[PDB]
A paper describes a structure:
The H+,K+-ATPase consists of two subunits. The α-subunit is composed of 10 transmembrane (TM) helices, in which the cation-binding sites are located, and three cytoplasmic domains (the nucleotide (N), phosphorylation (P) and actuator (A) domains) that catalyze ATP hydrolysis and the auto-phosphorylation reaction. The β-subunit is a single-span membrane protein with a short N-terminal cytoplasmic tail and a large C-terminal ectodomain, and it is involved in correct membrane integration and targeting of the complex to the cell surface.
To exclude the possibility that the observed single K+-binding results from an artifact of the Tyr799Trp mutation, we determined the wild-type WT(Rb+)E2-MgFx structure in the same conformation, despite its limited resolution of 4.3 Å. The β-subunit ectodomain in protomer A, and the A- and N-domains in protomer B show relatively weak density, due to lack of tight crystal packing at these regions. The N-terminal tail of the β-subunit is partially visible in the wild-type structure, in contrast to that in the Tyr799Trp structure. However, the well-ordered regions, especially for the TM helices that define the luminal-closed K+-occluded state, are almost identical to those of the high-resolution Tyr799Trp structure. At the cation-binding site of the wild-type, a single Rb+ anomalous peak is found at the position close to the bound K+ in Tyr799Trp, as well as at site II in Na+,K+-ATPase. An anomalous signal is hardly seen at the position corresponding to the cation-binding site I in Na+,K+-ATPase, even at the low contour level.
Residue numbers in the entry:
A (entry chain A): 47 to 1033
B (entry chain B): 20 to 290
Amino acid sequence: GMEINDHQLSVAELEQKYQTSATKGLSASLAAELLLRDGPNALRPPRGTPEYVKFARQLAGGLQCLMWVAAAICLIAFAIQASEGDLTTDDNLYLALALIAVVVVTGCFGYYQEFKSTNIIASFKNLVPQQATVIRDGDKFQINADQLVVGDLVEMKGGDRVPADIRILQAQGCKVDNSSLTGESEPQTRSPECTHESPLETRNIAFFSTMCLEGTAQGLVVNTGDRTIIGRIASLASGVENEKTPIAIEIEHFVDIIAGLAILFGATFFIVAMCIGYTFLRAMVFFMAIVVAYVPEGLLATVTVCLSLTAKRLASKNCVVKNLEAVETLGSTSVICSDKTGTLTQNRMTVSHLWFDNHIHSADTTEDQSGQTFDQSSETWRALCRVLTLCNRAAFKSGQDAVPVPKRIVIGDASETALLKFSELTLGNAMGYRERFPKVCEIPFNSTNKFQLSIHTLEDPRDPRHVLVMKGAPERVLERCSSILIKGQELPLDEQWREAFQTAYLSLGGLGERVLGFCQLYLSEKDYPPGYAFDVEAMNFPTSGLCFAGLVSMIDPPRATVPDAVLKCRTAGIRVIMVTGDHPITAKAIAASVGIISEGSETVEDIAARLRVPVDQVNRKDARACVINGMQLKDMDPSELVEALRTHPEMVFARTSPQQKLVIVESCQRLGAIVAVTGDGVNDSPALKKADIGVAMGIAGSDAAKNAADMILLDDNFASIVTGVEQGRLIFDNLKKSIAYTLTKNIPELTPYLIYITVSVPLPLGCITILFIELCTDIFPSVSLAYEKAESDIMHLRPRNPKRDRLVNEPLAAYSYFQIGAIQSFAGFTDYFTAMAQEGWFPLLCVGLRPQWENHHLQDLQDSYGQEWTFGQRLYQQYTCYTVFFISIEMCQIADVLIRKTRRLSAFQQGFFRNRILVIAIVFQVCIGCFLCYCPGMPNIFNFMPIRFQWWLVPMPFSLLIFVYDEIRKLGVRCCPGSWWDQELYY
Amino acid sequence: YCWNPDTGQMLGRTLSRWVWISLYYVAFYVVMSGIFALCIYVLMRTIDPYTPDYQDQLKSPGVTLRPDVYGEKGLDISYNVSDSTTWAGLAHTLHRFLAGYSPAAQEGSINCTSEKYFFQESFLAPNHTKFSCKFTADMLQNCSGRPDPTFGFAEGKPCFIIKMNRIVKFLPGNSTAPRVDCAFLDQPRDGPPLQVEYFPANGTYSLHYFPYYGKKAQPHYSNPLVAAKLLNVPRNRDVVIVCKILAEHVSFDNPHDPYEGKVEFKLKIQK
Ligand SMILES: CC(C)CCC[C@@H](C)[C@H]1CC[C@H]2[C@@H]3CC=C4C[C@@H](O)CC[C@]4(C)[C@H]3CC[C@]12C
Ligand SMILES: *[C@@H]1O[C@H](CO)[C@@H](O)[C@H](O)[C@H]1NC(C)=O
Ligand SMILES: *[C@@H]1O[C@H](CO)[C@@H](O)[C@H](O)[C@H]1NC(C)=O
Ligand SMILES: [K+]
Ligand SMILES: [K+]
Ligand SMILES: [K+]
Ligand SMILES: [Mg+2]
């Protein structure tokens, strides 16, 4: 079922399977029957839901389904009192359009968090060829790709990309680029032979969008459109369950807590309201006023704004997000699955070791040449360097003198590419040293030869000799060598040297690297004059008994900042997994090189050999590490996969289908994981989508990855991931300090209306001045905590448990609401009663006064000095309790923001003004509060009165209180982490 | 979604923790309640009994008229001079209003014949308070229920009662006793000015009624009244009559406060 099995079948079983011919192609008719059976050969573009219906849910939710009903209580309270002629209650038209403005701006504060939103299947139609070259009715012509059908007989040639999933029948020196399948850009030969059980390995299958590099081929289309291998890759990319992000679930958690809490409070006092005697057309205008008081309107704002002041900080260190939800995901991530090629690596074949002086010297594999150089004073070495430099046909292009040797562009294959660059580093110039020794002859690397060979005259005028240089497949370089350089001498090749060489070329062969022999020989002037008639195809020169000069080996080396980055993340408790398509034995070596595997860790295939015991006998548990190939995984249950992921802590997967990357990534997510994925290639996209954060490499990234990723490291500096963890743990711990500041004030916003409903005292805090506390004065101070530095060394902490530790947990809410908010309500009501008592109305008088207070028809209400008070003289003072409770709150939202600086330290033992942005928010909190208070026009427009200076002082012991109540608590958990003071009153 | 059962085993923790936390939280809660009450007890220990600290919403007093039959957006007094059971709901609301103004409900006050600020600084009256000055029914003379216990209402020239809003220590001035003067707001181009006649003479309020020293210092003190005998208002027309108080320390130019020194009332005298 869709399993490409056509590589196994014969030529005869094929014209039966597609009713076709082997040299004629299909019949012109049948090429349409299949097209009108299977549709065209292209990629079905999956539209998401439209661009405006993702504005439609952004206006719904737990805080958004309430602020629709309170603007529907405000336009059914500007509607039952405007048909009756009551122009005075445009306090509910001013209160309907400002709440729907809180619906849509907060709706714009959740939609403008999608920067790109680019279609992923945008970049799957750009790796594809426009036209093919087919045969039908035995005539060769040129056709559109989207006209190829299952059974079409196509011709490939190098330079064009492959136009279908095509089983090859004949092919002449044909090679492809299967990075898009393996992530590996090393040519893969193809042939009519069925060289594997899997069609992903065998050579008689060529895949849609694979760039055919060199040669020709003819074969039959076997899969089409989305049925091709690269098409299956696209179906998993777009077609991923868009699970909410970590913070999204946490956002929706406390929304559901507050959405439940706002519906208890207001709707047990609607039962109270009708049952202590208000009518229904009053009792419905208490829920509305309670919910505006309890719900923090501009909370959702302060959240997303905070996320931006991280994202910018991320961008400035060249890490750009694509939606704000990602900016935190790293700090909550437990597991990182990474591609190897051009993710941790440089995807650039480069030199690593060179066997000479019967000992393996370690070369310097870094993109900036930082690390450990090797032994270059050996006279036996400076010959080995003379052979590889000369015997090299690659070349730098003109005009790259300001380019780093690694990042230069070289003509030829990656082998000579590596050596040439290495030659440009140890030597000053690799090209000039090849011209002082001009070349007279050559044989390039052939395959009947299975080596390379060239012969040159010398730079020395006094030396007239001829020097032969050669390189080839290490074993074959030995059996045409009879002498050897050890430390400066030359020695015969006994059976003790033909054993110490077959040691090293198999030693580094366990590090999984390309190995190359090297050898030389100086042709004497007595049988080869300094102008001698060298004739190549005649083959008069000896081509044996040459002086071996030393192996060299090369590998796909890691990036400069990767092995330190990896160590930092496991030091943050994070488990790291290699997930690659590369061959197993390069992978394992790379994993220990970057530090996915730690010094001393063993496979079951490392143990069994040190004990000399077969592998089935090994106890699995013993192994610190394990390695699993593409076949093995497919042979596994997932039941066996978890037992494995459990059993061995350091894991390496390799030769993996892009299909299988995802499996692993979600097979972790099922165990409750927050999963990051870093990647660069077309193989990587589906596990970049499904990952709770996907990261792609900015430069070396293939587009399909980049358009699937949520984060983009522009500079590929992988150690950026560590900075994003730091700022995702920081933002996580810096969001719950801001929320508590925003949430504690919701209690002194609420308690007035409750009292005002029951005790029938005047309204202490009006819905207008509440909306200014929430939507202005305490916006800046709420956000300024996004600039707190950690209290514990955050990178030594394990990553949080994503079930247990939450953003708004039950203890934080209760402490801000019930305790801090109580003191904030007990300053606010201490100020409400001094302003009432110093201006005419004593305490008991307030009880039951509201009905006489809120009366247009009574312009004479005699107070507690008998003084008669007009309705405007009374409502002017109702504004002087709007504006005196309001400032009792603002005085407690300074001591708040200073005890929302620290969760474990004292503000004493770190400091008070260490955050400089915080102390700039406080002076704005204060000075928008005086602007509203004192500015002319404020009493009538915004309902704000120029209060007396003693009414700022009344809530000041209450603020000095709030600070030191939290102070004693912060020390209290320090000196005793165990006892009841820690386990119940911490947040 | 399946089935969503409750969380009865959600005693979030154990019944010893909940007695532990609860008696903590209320130990917090009541401590504050006694600190908050300690404050309002210190608050009601700084206050002064006869004089308010600040009158921040009492610069110019309000002014209020009787009979008070309201409609939407203002005072409206639209009756029937002939028909007698639609001015008996305005004639009785002026009477029962004055049922605390008679010489017997004025048994507490003393006659002031000073006609200047009634300045008192120590307490001589029955039960240690300051003295007041009478205001009686008959002083509105023809608009007091005698000789007119329908208050000019049958004769198309009724008698409203303009009532000031007394204020503690409030000095309106002492060069003159401040008067009433009720006239149209829109002077009609074909009609005449609202010719009107006040009780007692000039429509003033005597200077011996002030200063007010609280409802504790002059307990039985009564506001002085006036009664404008409105003559002109033509029959079957809707006019607007503004009843101001002109004075030294009084204004009537507050566009947010329509009952501050002036009281605007629609009036219709049908036939
Ligand atoms: C002061 C008087 C009048 C009210 C007392 C009501 C009691 C039953 C209320 C008031 C405060 C409430 C507590 C406030 C905070 C928390 C912490 C939270 O993690 C669980 C619920 C819990 C523990 C609440 C339980 C019920 C509670 C104790
Ligand atoms: C106080 O004096 C008044 C005199 O007006 C008297 O009527 C009243 O009964 C007295 N009350 C007390 C408690 O002495
Ligand atoms: C008015 O009052 C002042 C009090 O400051 C007083 O000195 C003055 O004599 C009075 N003048 C008149 C005309 O009553
Ligand atoms: K609010
Ligand atoms: K690539
Ligand atoms: K994702
Ligand atoms: Mg790659």
